[PDB]
Design a protein around this nucleic acid. Structure first.
Ligand SMILES: [Mg+2]
Ligand SMILES: [Mg+2]
Lengths: 334, 338
DNA sequence: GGTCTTCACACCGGTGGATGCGTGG
DNA sequence: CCACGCATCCACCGGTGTGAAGACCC
């Protein structure tokens, strides 16, 4: 459950608990006595509650409390089980909190995408959570798909192979000189649903929670669209970077600087809307150092990062995503 | 001293100690009970010993132990003074160790540059540490200057005003659209000594240690060259990034990707020899993801394409860094006429 | 206008998991 | 002579030290 409950933790299986005791089975070059299991805590805390689509006390709750509830639940569970012995270095809580932010925001915008698709097909506009109805003409061809890209994806395998051959041969020509184009995969891709996927019912049902089958469904959602996305159908790219610093904001920038290079200067796409989400952009000047330029081609100059967002609540992210979808989907024809 | 000594630590003044007790004077948004004094630690440990130019036991010692000795000295000092109460979070030891790595390597290469300048001017080749004499023709115009760039420098102020006007105009044109070219300053810049400084005796004396006056001298070495180097006279840039990861290594790459953009695509310089130094490149593939491209110039081919990072280095010992710097200077100074 | 306090810059180290590989029927 | 399992890599963030700049009471 969202709030910690002793009975539900007791009823959990040994291999399904938030904290795994690996004192007797150490990792090779680490001293992690107790290991947080981010999948298990995600399925435990956000099992029946998804932020922005749950009771009105969770949608309006500060996002820094929703993203950080699973770590509190894990710490309480570990204290309950291994009392006077539980200890996790903050360098594990940081990684786990970042991954939880990534997955929770991806789930929230996946629910938003499912609601948008349901509206576009013609199944009405669900009003259980009070959200404004978009002022766009419904159309099955305007539907959207939210992909949570994996840890070490290629991000080009999504492209249609008639437009992937040029990118592959560009990389091959670069490889002849012992060079490359390395990049980190953007943490989420919002694309236009392909033509043959607009009758599927899996893109129109909101997930009840982030259970393990739902985690598998969300994580593996990119496989179904592998090789079915046109270069211009990549509507948005999102980098989830919680609490940026003055040197860690240059990884997303590169993540965009290469991205446009492979979509603007070599594929003819109009623009790439790469944007960064963060929770605590303090101790940094990210609001003014994210106005960086790009490869500029030769006119063709623009911001590398479209915007930086700091979601106040969990519902504000959903509202902003709905507004952005309403603003952009009008460009496509359906 | 290098090895911890109780008497010398006791003789230190309260404001000159490695660890500062700021429990009663907390920082604004932090809970740092004890603050490591990076400058005081550097002046205490490396106060009379510079790695690579000291006794043969320190030159050959593993670099991961030389870079990490001051933190051990501070921990021992704090345990000695605030017993049963000293504790500093590893997120402070990491920052301190990185800064110590940067400053110590900068001092080592500064000593190498001083020896090279002494050889070029005509004072022979000092042979107290056994280093190979470069096989290059001595000339006062081949002298090199090592600058330890500050935390929030610009690195464009170093260029001559004639060659800075084009960069400033490009930045102003970008600024007209609400844009910019932000970048992190490379941690060190090796440049060719300006002709008007080629007789100063300051760039030819090896520092005996990293004392506070010598720390100030090394840190403020860039001020004297503010607007006196040529676009083609920036010999090399060095990013000291200790123990890279699979996501932090993209910060130096950008630091180079912008750099060439302002030296090759807007100044006509032949090439920029940006390179990265690290101690523990484990848990990553930095040896392969540092073959990245650049602004790529023309469409394709071998016209204006090259590695953004020239090479990744992992110094085994403290003397190996000096040997590599000497070899690089000898190999690449024949390009400059003299 | 001179101490004093505050904020941004660049620092790294300890991790969880998906995935390609090591060895044995 | 293909497997079940262990090993390596990818991307995560949070706690800091110091220098330059704002405060401000003159
Ligand atoms: Mg991220
Ligand atoms: Mg560095």
């Amino acid at each position: 459950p969202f709030t910690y409950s002793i009975e539900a933790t007791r009823n959990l299986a040994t291999t399904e608990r938030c904290i795994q005791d690996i004192r007797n089975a150490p990792v090779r070059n680490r001293s992690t006595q107790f290991q947080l299991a981010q999948q298990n805590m995600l399925a435990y805390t956000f099992g029946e509650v998804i932020p922005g689509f749950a009771s009105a006390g969770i949608n309006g709750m500060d996002y820094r409390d929703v993203i950080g509830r699973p770590v509190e639940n894990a710490v309480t569970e570990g204290t309950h089980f291994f009392r006077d012995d539980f200890r996790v270095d903050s360098n594990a809580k940081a990684k786990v909190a970042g991954d939880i932010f990534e997955i929770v925001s991806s789930a929230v915008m996946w629910n938003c995408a499912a609601r948008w698709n349901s509206l576009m097909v013609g199944e009405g506009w669900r009003s259980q959570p009070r959200y404004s109805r978009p002022t766009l003409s419904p159309s099955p061809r305007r539907q959207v798909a939210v992909l949570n890209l994996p840890r070490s994806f290629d991000w080009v395998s999504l492209l249609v192979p008639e437009s992937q051959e040029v990118i592959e041969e560009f990389r091959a020509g670069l490889r002849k000189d012992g060079l490359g184009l390395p990049t980190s995969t953007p943490d989420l891709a919002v694309v236009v649903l392909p033509e043959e996927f607009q009758n599927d019912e899996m893109w129109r049902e909101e997930i009840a929670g982030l259970t393990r089958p739902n985690q598998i469904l969300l994580s593996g959602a990119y496989q179904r669209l592998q090789g079915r996305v046109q270069p211009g159908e990549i509507s948005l790219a999102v980098a989830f970077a919680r609490s940026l610093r003055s040197d860690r904001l240059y990884q997303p920038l590169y993540e965009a600087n290469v991205m446009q290079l492979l979509l603007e200067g070599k594929l003819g796409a109009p623009k790439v809307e790469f944007e960064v989400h963060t929770l605590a952009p303090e101790g940094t000047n990210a609001f003014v150092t994210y106005e960086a330029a790009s490869l500029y081609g030769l006119s063709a100059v623009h911001r590398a990062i479209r915007e930086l967002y700091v979601p106040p609540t969990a519902a504000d992210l959903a509202r902003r995503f709905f507004a952005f979808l309403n603003e952009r989907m009008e460009k496509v024809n359906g």
